[PDB]
Design a protein around this ligand. Structure first.
Ligand SMILES: CN(C)[C@@H]1C(=O)C(C(N)=O)=C(O)[C@@]2(O)C(=O)C3=C(O)c4c(O)c(NC(=O)CN5CCCC5)cc(F)c4C[C@H]3C[C@@H]12
Ligand SMILES: [Mg+2]
Ligand SMILES: [Mg+2]
Ligand SMILES: [Mg+2]
Ligand SMILES: [Mg+2]
Ligand SMILES: [Mg+2]
Ligand SMILES: [Mg+2]
Ligand SMILES: [Mg+2]
Ligand SMILES: [Mg+2]
Ligand SMILES: [Mg+2]
Ligand SMILES: [Mg+2]
Ligand SMILES: [Mg+2]
Ligand SMILES: [Mg+2]
Ligand SMILES: [Mg+2]
Ligand SMILES: [Mg+2]
Ligand SMILES: [Mg+2]
Ligand SMILES: [Mg+2]
Ligand SMILES: [Mg+2]
Lengths: 136, 126, 82, 100, 100, 215
RNA sequence: CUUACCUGGCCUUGACAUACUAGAAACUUUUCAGAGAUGGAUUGGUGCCUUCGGGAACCUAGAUACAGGUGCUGCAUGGCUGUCGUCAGCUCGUGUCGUGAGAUGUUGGGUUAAGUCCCGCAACGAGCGCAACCCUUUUCCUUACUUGCCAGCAUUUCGGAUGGGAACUUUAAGGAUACUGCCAGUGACAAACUGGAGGAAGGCGGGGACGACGUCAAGUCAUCAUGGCCCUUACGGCCAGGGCUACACACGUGCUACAAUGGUCGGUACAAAGGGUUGCUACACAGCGAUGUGAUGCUAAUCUCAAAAAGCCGAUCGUAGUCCGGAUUGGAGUCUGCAACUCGACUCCAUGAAGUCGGAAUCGCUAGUAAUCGCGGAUCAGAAUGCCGCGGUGAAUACGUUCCCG
């Protein structure tokens, strides 16, 4: 903007698990203001993963995001702490969209479970990005 | 016994708070009947949830105007103000939480020559 | 379409000409400007010359025409392609 | 506007005034159920037999100071050109520039 | 069981307030009891007027006119109250309607 | 750029309307048109009476017209015959009885309209525009205005190419809403066409808002 | 109709003004011819003032000065408007300097939205612009208590419905509050900028009006006014039909979709601003429906347009050109209008096109914003996907100034 340090916005923690990571992922899922639908999708996916394996919903999500997070992007440049999280959050929903399970919440839960083991489309995309990073 | 008035985006809420067991009535309805969005219920419950006083009070609330989110915010502001009226020593923690502030954001008016408040018609040089 | 409760519309000055023609057996065409009048059963077997803006075009009324407007048979624009 | 157009509008308004009563009576007769169908048909024919300038649909609102046929504003009976000038001089009561 | 209802309309709230206060003062002086003035919702009419004569569709003036209303009730009226209210003068810009 | 009308922008702030009456939405148009015809008739009839302000009111089924003039005697008449005739004509234009009140102007040099007519008459009588502008600008300042501005546009001296010339003394703060500014316009019809005259007069600032004027 | 255009039919001191002369109240009832404009017949009446001698209004007949022109010139003009651009500039007095025209002030280091402010400095000071004074929104107080309100009482056909209360919401006039005021850094000990407490709100809180000196002989003689030049049995005026809606094509601005974060069906919540007496209409009956008939309340915080829609719960559809999409076409109807052929809107049955997310390129947006959902109004007999407004739900991202534009 040529004259200001415009401050970063502060989004409220989610009303259920009180996690800003879940809040930001919810905002990434939301389209054109349909927060209720985005909330239903994400909260259903989390409940499904919890039922399948009994773990704290927040810990599993943070661990999976850590696996999915890119290191660098192409002269190669190191991305700042927020940009990696944004990229991982985007690619997770992108892969869940192309998944072919019944409902969006269920296929999001399936994608998260696959990424946790490492046999997931998002993890494969990260591997492809890493492979291309060797060009320079 | 104590009273509070809450406002958020054209929604106004009248909250009467008395020492009780935990009943909560909105517009002669019950919380789950009035709000079908669980997030709205949790937003409403935040104040007493913070103070661990859910079972120490009863709530009789009327609300008018706005939409679902606006009415939920107005009810939360009203409950906060009623708690302040009941006791002043609570106000520090409530302010730290952020429930004291009256959110002043409102819709911006549409402007002549524009499609919306800020959105502009598509431009072409040739 | 005009409401059925009001009935079909015919200009009175054209209706009088039609009635006189049918009462007689004059085959002479009836010249009119009423493109908006409805073609009735009494018009069948007659020639009506309908204005199109610059000329009157003759129309011989058949049974299949009943229910149409007079102007439907007198086009007003000329076009032969680009 | 040309003075002929103003005179045409004045003539049409006078014609409508001259026939309002007969027109109302005829339409009432048409809409009267208790009357026989023949009377209603005669009423319809008499209604169609009036001069065309008896129809209010052919009146067009004009400025009132210039005769402009566009931009009328029924409330003031003036067109936009004259309304702007008259308002900005303070000659139209209660009207001010709007900011909200 | 006699109760006088007064309704005031204007395009200027200052003038309407002056008139209403004069009415209340007159009624109180004659000795009746009054309720009001009660402010009713205001009407706002808005207009968009092109400022250019020919082709500048984005160049407009926005005007508004506001109709203000007030309501007053006089109960337990004395004999002199009606005569005093009738004798009260009429001020331009304010319309007064009395209902008995 | 183009500038807003000095009086219109101040109509609700520090200035009053020249028309003060109420009307239902049905009679508004008729009342407005009849008032406009009254203004036209007065403007034509009282050209030589140095009349600037016309204020129309409709108290109750009747009309009161207040005419501000510098020459009250001309409008009133020797025996008061003229006022009765004016009332009769104004009543004919209206549909209700009309009564006229006269307001004498003590300082014609501080009124923008009268100054505008003074300049326009000279320009028609072939007085040099710069001379007329300087004379008016000096007379107003000597009368005691905090500021004045005069502008003349058209074919000055019958030239082929029109131009605009302006002259000012004092201060004229147009952007200050509470500032009291008199404004007027006038046409001077000459052999080569029309020359337009504009006059601003700044007389000081109003403190207290529209309330002080007792609206 | 509008309407300025075309075809044909018509008038000529004219549809409209003033001046002169004569006769008739003005008006008004029924026909005929005609596409109408027009023409020709044809009933009823003798009005308001008079020093009643003649006059007012409004008509008819003659007469010439004249009227009339959306015909040309925006490059002969007034008025009005776009644009750079809400960009930060534009200048004077007194002083000094120069033989001079002129110069300084207004330049330099910072800062700011800003010629905003402080520093320095032969400059010392002031005006128009900036800002502020005006409107609206967020917190609170006073006045007001109906047609709006219902905390406590009661009476309740469980509807503020009634007796009632003046608490609360709200309606709308007047007031209060923010000032870098207090604290810690910071900078030149300045200006200014950072980070804290309080506070509903914190560093011009958020928006709207307000357009400096000037630029493009930029737009408008078709709102209007105006110099000059043109026509006058027509370039003026009256009328019926047609055109402005044409269609091998090319562009700009929009709407609707290509679906599962979705479509359909059943149930069920939550607004704000506007409109309404030649108008909006509760309610009943008829119709599948657009609507029709009867009837009720409203000139409206009183009655009414009115169903908010996205939302929530349940069922089904299971990636198909489909229970996506809704163009086109065939039938049948309603309403407004003298009249829906050219050329209206809307309703029902049937039909079911392109479209699988769009090339080189290119547009808007920094927060209650974008996106998405519905609601209202001016124009208006009828005719919005346009324009001007209203609220509901509610994001992402700015490291930075190299490159592109002003
Ligand atoms: C592309 N086009 C929009 C131009 C454009 O783009 C620009 C721009 N700034 O870019 C503009 O200037 C324009 O729009 C414009 O307005 C112009 C005129 O007025 C004008 C004019 O009036 C006369 N006048 C006469 O010939 C009269 N004579 C008297 C005796 C015989 C004839 C002569 C003349 F050459 C012109 C030039 C135009 C140019 C025009
Ligand atoms: Mg608003
Ligand atoms: Mg919106
Ligand atoms: Mg059809
Ligand atoms: Mg003309
Ligand atoms: Mg029309
Ligand atoms: Mg036409
Ligand atoms: Mg020009
Ligand atoms: Mg300013
Ligand atoms: Mg030009
Ligand atoms: Mg041009
Ligand atoms: Mg025609
Ligand atoms: Mg067109
Ligand atoms: Mg569902
Ligand atoms: Mg479908
Ligand atoms: Mg295909
Ligand atoms: Mg910006
Ligand atoms: Mg309409």
């Amino acid at each position: 903007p040529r004259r200001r340090v415009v401050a970063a916005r502060e989004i409220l923690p989610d009303p259920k698990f009180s996690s800003q990571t879940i809040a930001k992922f919810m905002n990434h899922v939301m389209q054109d203001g349909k927060k209720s639908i985005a909330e239903s999708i994400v909260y259903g996916a989390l409940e499904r993963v919890q039922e399948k394996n009994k773990v704290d919903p927040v810990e599993f999500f943070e661990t999976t995001l850590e696996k999915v997070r890119p290191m660098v992007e192409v002269v190669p440049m190191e991305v700042r702490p927020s940009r990696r999280t944004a990229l991982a959050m985007r690619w997770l929903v992108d892969a869940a969209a192309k998944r072919s399970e019944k409902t969006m919440a269920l296929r999001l839960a399936g994608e998260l479970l696959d990424a946790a083991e490492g046999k997931g489309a998002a993890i494969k995309k990260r591997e492809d990005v890493h492979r291309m990073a060797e060009a320079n | 016994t104590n009273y509070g008035t809450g406002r958020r985006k054209t929604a106004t809420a009248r909250v009467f708070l008395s020492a009780g067991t935990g009943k909560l009535v909105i517009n002669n309805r019950t919380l789950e009947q009035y709000f079908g969005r669980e997030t709205a219920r949790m937003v409403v419950r935040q104040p007493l949830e913070l103070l661990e006083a859910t079972e120490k009070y009863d709530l009789y609330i009327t609300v008018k105007g706005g939409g679902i989110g606006g009415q939920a915010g107005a009810i939360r502001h009203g409950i906060t103000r009623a708690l302040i009226a009941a006791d002043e020593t609570l106000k520090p923690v409530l302010r730290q939480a952020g429930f004291v502030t009256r959110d002043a954001r409102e819709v911006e008016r549409k402007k002549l020559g524009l499609r919306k408040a800020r959105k502009r018609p598509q431009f072409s040089k040739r | 379409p005009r409401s059925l409760k009001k009935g079909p519309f015919v200009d009175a000055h054209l209706f009088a000409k039609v009635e006189a023609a049918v009462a007689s057996n004059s085959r002479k065409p009836i010249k009119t400007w009423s493109r908006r009048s409805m073609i009735l059963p009494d018009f069948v077997g007659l020639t009506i010359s309908v204005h199109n803006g610059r000329n009157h075009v003759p129309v011989i009324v058949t049974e299949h025409m009943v229910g149409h407007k007079l102007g439907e048979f007198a086009p007003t624009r000329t076009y032969r392609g680009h | 506007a040309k003075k002929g157009m103003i005179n045409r509008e004045l003539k049409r308004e006078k014609t409508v005034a001259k026939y309002a009563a007969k027109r109302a009576e005829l339409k009432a007769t048409i809409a009267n159920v208790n009357a026989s169908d023949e009377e209603r048909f005669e009423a319809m024919l008499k209604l169609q037999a009036l001069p065309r300038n008896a129809s209010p649909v052919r009146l067009r609102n004009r400025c009132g100071l210039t005769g402009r046929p566009h931009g009328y504003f029924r409330k003031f009976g003036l067109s936009r050109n004259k309304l702007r000038d008259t308002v900005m001089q303070g000659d139209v009561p209660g009207v001010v520039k709007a900011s909200w | 069981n006699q109760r006088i209802r007064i309704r005031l309309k204007s395009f200027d709230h200052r003038l309407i307030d002056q008139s209403a206060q004069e009415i209340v003062e007159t009624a109180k002086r004659t000795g009746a009891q009054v309720c009001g003035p009660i402010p009713m919702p205001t009407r706002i009419e808005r207009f968009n007027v092109l400022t250019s004569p020919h082709v500048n569709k984005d160049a407009r003036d926005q005007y508004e006119i506001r109709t203000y209303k007030r309501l007053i009730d006089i109960v337990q009226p004395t004999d002199k109250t009606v005569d005093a209210l009738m004798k009260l003068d009429l001020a331009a810009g304010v319309d007064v309607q009395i209902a008995l | 750029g183009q500038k807003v009308h000095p009086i219109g922008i101040r109509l609700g702030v520090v200035k009053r309307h020249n028309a003060n009456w109420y009307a239902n939405p049905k009679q508004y148009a008729e009342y407005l048109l009849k008032d406009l015809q009254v203004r036209e008739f007065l403007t034509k009839k009282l050209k030589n009476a140095m009349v600037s302000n016309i204020l129309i009111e409709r108290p109750s089924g009747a009309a009161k017209v207040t005419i501000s003039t510098a020459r009250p005697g001309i409008v009133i008449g020797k025996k008061g015959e003229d006022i009765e005739k004016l009332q009769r004509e104004l009543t004919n234009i209206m549909g209700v009885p009309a009564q006229v009140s006269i307001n004498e102007i003590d300082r014609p040099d501080l009124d923008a309209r009268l100054v505008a007519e003074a300049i326009a008459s000279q320009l028609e009588k072939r007085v040099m525009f710069r001379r007329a502008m300087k004379r008016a600008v000096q007379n107003t300042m000597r009368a005691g205005a905090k500021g004045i501005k005069v502008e003349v546009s058209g074919r000055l001296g019958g030239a082929e190419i029109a131009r605009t010339e302006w002259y000012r003394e004092g201060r004229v703060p147009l952007h200050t809403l509470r500032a009291d500014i008199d404004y007027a316009t006038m046409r001077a019809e000459t052999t080569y066409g029309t020359i337009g005259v504009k006059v601003w007069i700044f007389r000081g600032e109003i403190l207290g808002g529209m309330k002080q004027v007792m609206n």
